[PDB]
Design an enzyme around this catalytic site. Structure first.
Site, PDB file in Angstrom:
ATOM      1  CG  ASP A 111      36.937  24.927 -28.369  1.00 32.01           C
ATOM      2  OD1 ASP A 111      36.938  24.570 -29.565  1.00 32.01           O
ATOM      3  OD2 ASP A 111      37.964  24.921 -27.658  1.00 32.01           O
ATOM      4  CE  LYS A 116      40.232  18.340 -31.330  1.00 34.40           C
ATOM      5  NZ  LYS A 116      40.761  19.711 -31.090  1.00 34.40           N
ATOM      6  CD  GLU A 170      38.951  23.385 -33.524  1.00 34.74           C
ATOM      7  OE1 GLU A 170      40.086  23.479 -34.034  1.00 34.74           O
ATOM      8  OE2 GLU A 170      38.625  22.453 -32.761  1.00 34.74           O
ATOM      9  CG  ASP A 226      43.604  25.062 -33.535  1.00 33.46           C
ATOM     10  OD1 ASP A 226      43.907  25.462 -32.391  1.00 33.46           O
ATOM     11  OD2 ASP A 226      42.799  24.130 -33.738  1.00 33.46           O
TER      12      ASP A 226
END
Lengths: 140, 505, 90
Positions: free
Chosen positions: B6, B68, B145, B166
């Site tokens: 992840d 990211k 995700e 999230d």
């Protein structure tokens, strides 16, 4: 029939290709009975020191500012560090030494050439060979 | 072999597949989440994680903190180099995770699934895949995700409707997915500058303002005091998902008289100062609801994803955006995505399903021994097709026959456990206790059929039972045995009988 | 010559072999994982033996009322709060 025989052959090949893989993985995990067996438990040893490191630093800066350079609580700190020394407390980031990124948690850069610690705001602490908390050092 | 990675803007968790299950590999220094501050050294020796972050607080401009947050866009720097390519910075933490998978016993971790936020793009997927293949790790799935978290919690079917929240920590993402025969996602949108780091900075600012109120110290140039305040705030935030009454007290901030900063930060104040960040969530959720045909009850399940979702405010917002529906539990929110990536990696290359792991748990399997006690042979959750052994002996001198009863029910007292059957072996010659050895085996196949056989090692006498009553139990009553066993946790009376066995020898 | 019965027997046997091996793998993956947590008792060790003496010393100092000052009152309370979670009382 021929198609049924081919399907049976494919199933046999798949099961054979899975059996040795699961056996090898089982052996690999069996090897772990003595390799990481003490590592996962000694994570608790790391924790029982990672929790106390804050109090250790508090006492350290109490001695540094002179409010606890002596006195019964200074003796208490001495007893604590002496007892923990048997477990392998090797303080790093000593003044005048090289700046080690893997060992030192440098925060303030007072001067922009060998890097060196200007002052240990927080003395780094250790437990045997396990690096616990990087030393808070002012790289100069 | 399969690895579940992840990658993240703030954290990164790696999880490899130990047969049919994923396990979150701890990094080099004990932790699981590698702080993804891929910072280069003073000279050459590239560091990742805390070994790189500690060189970043001092050297701000010798570090790439978050990658990211940039996909395709060249968020690139140079350190003794010349325009280092952007995705290779995350490829560095990918290489670190590939190396660190060996912390758990492994040989060559060459298959992995990397995860990307729901907010996606062909460019984003291509960049993540290029970083993976540069890192030296073959990747076939770049699952979003949301769906990765859903798979981690377990959703592989009717027409499921999974919602994802999230929180992230640095980035935000909410979406509703209808899981059917295929992996389905409709439309994703959410905050990009919002995350738990904003809650941390908010409590930091509150503490700074309170100290400026209590004394004239600026507390904006005492870098040691800044680190103390930031660490205290993060610790308080993580601890605020318990003990609603909270306080912190940093001993030595700055003196001339040592000033003693002390505030009793209350979650009430936490909401009072973070309500803007919280209400920034409303627009993405309404947007994803209104993009397609969705009702408040159209959501089947919701999963809490991302680090530090344990904040009561976020759970309240999720359960007030759909109703009193509870989310899924079992996997830690900061590592749900890696677990899902590992499970998907196992599925893709043929490591789950089949006839393997369809067997789950034959509840209880054991044989009652002398003294109202049962000797467990097969553990409670042990996969059904097992094999065991045990050398028992006659409990009395010159005993002609020994009767052994198989019982289920984890309770140490077999009187309250259910009777399944009894098999008695005869032909035992008269001998004193201790020398005889009676071999007992539990042979069980895929379907759940049990075989309990006792054979005399000393002579050869053998008797067999075919109780076969392990299977067929109602699933509703199975969960009741869990509570029945867990309620009487403090049950050590069997040690009294074990001591009473002192008569032998 | 067809050996259809032989192939069916091999299917019925290799499936059971796969099942047995995976069950052994899971059983031992739970076994050794149970020792991973049973060794936490050894990991406890004499850490409390070294913390309880420190706690007793600071408490004996506190009995005289010294731990009623300002910045001097922080260390003992912080140590007690951190210790209580990972240590027994005096």
């Amino acid at each position: 029939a021929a198609a049924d025989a081919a399907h049976t052959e494919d199933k046999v090949a798949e099961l054979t290709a899975d059996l040795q893989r699961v056996q090898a993985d089982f052996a690999n995990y069996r090897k772990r009975a003595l390799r990481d067996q003490q590592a996962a438990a000694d994570r608790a040893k790391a924790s029982v020191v990672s929790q106390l490191l804050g109090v250790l630093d508090d006492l350290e800066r109490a001695r540094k500012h002179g409010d606890l350079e002596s006195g019964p609580l200074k003796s208490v700190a001495d007893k604590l560090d002496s007892a923990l020394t048997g477990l392998g407390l090797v303080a790093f980031g000593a003044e005048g030494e090289d700046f080690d990124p893997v060992l030192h948690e440098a925060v303030q850069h007072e001067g922009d050439s060998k890097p060196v610690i200007g002052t240990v705001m927080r003395q780094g602490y250790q437990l045997g060979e396990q690096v616990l908390r990087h030393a808070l050092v002012g790289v100069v | 072999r399969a690895v579940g990675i992840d990658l993240g803007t703030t954290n990164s968790v790696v999880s490899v597949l130990e047969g049919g299950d994923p396990v979150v590999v701890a990094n080099s220094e004990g932790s699981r989440t590698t702080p993804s501050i891929v910072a280069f050294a003073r000279n050459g020796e590239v560091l990742v994680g805390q070994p790189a972050k500690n060189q970043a607080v001092t050297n701000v401009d010798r570090t790439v903190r978050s990658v990211k947050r940039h996909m395709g866009s060249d968020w690139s720097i140079e350190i003794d180099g010349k325009k280092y390519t952007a995705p290779e910075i995350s490829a560095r933490i990918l290489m670190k995770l590939k190396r660190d998978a060996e912390a758990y016993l492994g040989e060559d971790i060459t298959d992995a699934v990397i995860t990307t936020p729901a907010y996606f793009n062909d460019a984003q997927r291509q960049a993540t895949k290029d970083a993976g293949q540069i890192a030296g790790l073959n990747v076939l799935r770049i699952v979003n995700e949301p769906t990765a978290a859903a798979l981690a919690y377990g959703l592989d079917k009717k027409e499921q409707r999974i919602l994802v929240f999230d929180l992230g920590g640095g980035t935000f993402d909410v979406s509703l997915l209808e899981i059917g025969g295929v992996v389905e996602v409709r439309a994703t949108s959410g905050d990009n500058h919002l995350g738990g780091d904003d809650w941390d900075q908010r409590v930091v600012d509150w503490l700074v303002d309170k100290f400026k109120g209590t004394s004239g110290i600026d507390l904006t140039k005492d870098k040691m005091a800044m680190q103390r305040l930031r660490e205290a705030a993060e610790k308080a935030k993580i601890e605020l998902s318990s003990s609603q009454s909270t306080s912190i007290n940093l001993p030595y901030i700055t003196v001339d008289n040592p000033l003693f900063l002390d505030e009793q930060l209350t979650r009430a104040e936490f909401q009072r100062i973070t309500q803007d960040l919280l209400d920034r969530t409303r627009k993405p959720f309404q947007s994803v609801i209104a993009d397609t045909g969705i009702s408040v009850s159209e959501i089947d399940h919701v999963v809490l994803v991302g680090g530090s979702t344990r904040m009561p405010a976020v759970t309240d917002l999720v359960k007030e955006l759909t109703g009193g529906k509870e989310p899924n539990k079992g996997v830690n929110p900061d590592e749900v995505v890696a677990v899902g990536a590992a499970l998907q990696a196992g599925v893709l290359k043929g490591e789950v399903k089949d006839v393997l792991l369809l067997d789950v748990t034959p509840l209880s399997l054991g044989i009652e021994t002398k003294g109202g006690v049962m000797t467990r042979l097969i553990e409670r959750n042990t996969t059904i097709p097992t094999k065991r052994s045990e050398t028992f002996t006659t409990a009395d001198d010159n005993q002609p026959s020994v009767q052994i009863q198989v019982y289920q029910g984890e309770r140490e007292i077999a009187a309250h456990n259910k009777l399944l059957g009894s098999f008695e072996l005869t032909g035992i010659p008269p001998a004193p206790r201790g020398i005889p050895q009676i071999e007992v085996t539990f042979d069980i196949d895929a379907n759940g059929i049990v075989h309990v056989t006792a054979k005399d090692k000393g002579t050869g006498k053998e008797n067999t039972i075919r109780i076969q009553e392990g299977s067929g139990l109602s699933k509703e009553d199975i969960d009741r045995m869990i509570k029945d066993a867990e309620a009487h946790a403090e049950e050590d009376r069997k040690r009294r009988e074990e001591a009473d066995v002192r008569n032998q020898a």
